[PDB]
Amino acid sequence: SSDLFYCDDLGKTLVNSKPDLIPRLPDGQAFDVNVAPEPGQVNVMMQLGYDELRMIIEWARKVPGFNELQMEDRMALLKSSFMDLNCLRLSYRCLPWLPKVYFGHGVVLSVEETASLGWNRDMITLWEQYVERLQEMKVDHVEFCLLNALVLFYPDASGLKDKPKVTSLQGDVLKSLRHYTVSRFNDSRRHAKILLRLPALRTFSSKALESYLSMALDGVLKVDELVTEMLS
Ligand SMILES: [Cl-]
Ligand SMILES: [Cl-]
């Protein structure tokens, strides 16, 4: 792609790590919004949510400095960023499908249909605000890819042991982002503007029940056991 021409070495690797993959339902499973899942099975929002959790972990391992960190620092970064990463990935792929929510291949729902599947007016409001920022920022493919790595390398992550290393790793990503926006658009200010406009659901605890869909994600799949398995 023409975009990688304005990236540095780290920037090319982060674009090639593909944080833009989209979750899918199992092969041959048709989705019909009118035909309820209710009673032994889980709905498509959760199926896609769990598929995406696995994809986020798979992406994180391709991020240069991640595997060098000790297992508990990798576990801390993922736990802290899962909500922000899911929100960023979802909002970005929704942009051509607006006003609908594009949860995954074969699943595009209006905001009203999301409510019947697990979401509440509170989670709808958060997604609305997150899409609005990406639209304002006018984020391109490269910028989205780099933003995923910036969200991952969060130095204030709870239970993080090697804070200076994550700070330096975030620094390396910041350098790739300013390098890119300067080389392609020749606007020194663009990197700082997108970084200041980006919502961060960690400033105020995401446990505020406005976007506590992570409790359903952590409860059903027992995320701690799966993360250890995937990072081993
Ligand atoms: Cl995909
Ligand atoms: Cl430097």
Residue numbers in the entry: 158 to 389
Task: Give excerpts from the publication.
To this end, the NR7 LBD was expressed in E. coli, purified to homogeneity and crystallized in P3212 space group. One molecule of the NR7 LBD is found in the asymmetric unit of the crystal, suggesting that the NR7 LBD behaves as a monomer. The overall structure of the NR7 LBD contains 10 α-helices arranged in a three-layered antiparallel helical sandwich with the canonical fold of NR LBDs. Noticeable differences compared to other NR LBDs are as follows: (i) the bending of helix H6 towards the interior of the receptor accompanied by the shortening of the adjacent helix H3, which is almost two turns shorter at its N-terminal end compared to what is seen in the structures of RXR or ERR LBDs and, more remarkably, (ii) the collapse of the central part of the region normally attributed to helices H10 and H11 (in orange in Fig. 3B). In particular, helix 10 is shortened to a two-turn helical portion (called H10’). It collapses to an unstructured loop at the level of a proline residue that is conserved in NR7, but also found in HNF4 and RXR that is further connected to an almost perpendicularly positioned three-turn helical region that is a remnant of helix 11 (called H11’). At the C-terminal end of this short helical region is helix H12, which is located in the coactivator binding site of the LBD, hence suggesting that in the crystal, NR7 is in an inactive or repressed conformation. The residues constituting the loop connecting H10’ and H11’ possess high B factors and weak electron density, suggesting that this region is partially disordered and flexible. In particular, the large side chain of the aromatic residue Trp276 in the loop connecting H6 to H7 (L6-7) is inserted into the pocket and occupies a significant fraction of the cavity, leaving no space for the binding of a putative ligand (pocket size of 112 Å3 as calculated with CASTp, smaller than the pocket of the orphan receptor ERRα LBD). The observed conformation of this region has significant consequences on the dimerization properties of NR7 and eventually on its biological function since it leads to a reduction of the dimerization interface and potentially a weak or impaired dimerization capacity.
Nuclear receptors (NRs) form a superfamily of DNA-binding transcription factors involved in cell growth and differentiation, embryonic development, and metabolism. All NRs share a common modular structure composed of a highly conserved DNA-binding domain (DBD) and a less conserved ligand-binding domain (LBD). By analyzing these unclassified NR sequences from emerging model organisms, we could define a new subfamily that we named NR7. Through a detailed structural, functional, and evolutionary analysis of the NR7 from the cephalochordate amphioxus (Branchiostoma lanceolatum), we established that NR7 is a constitutive transcriptional activator that dimerizes with RXR in a DNA-dependent manner.
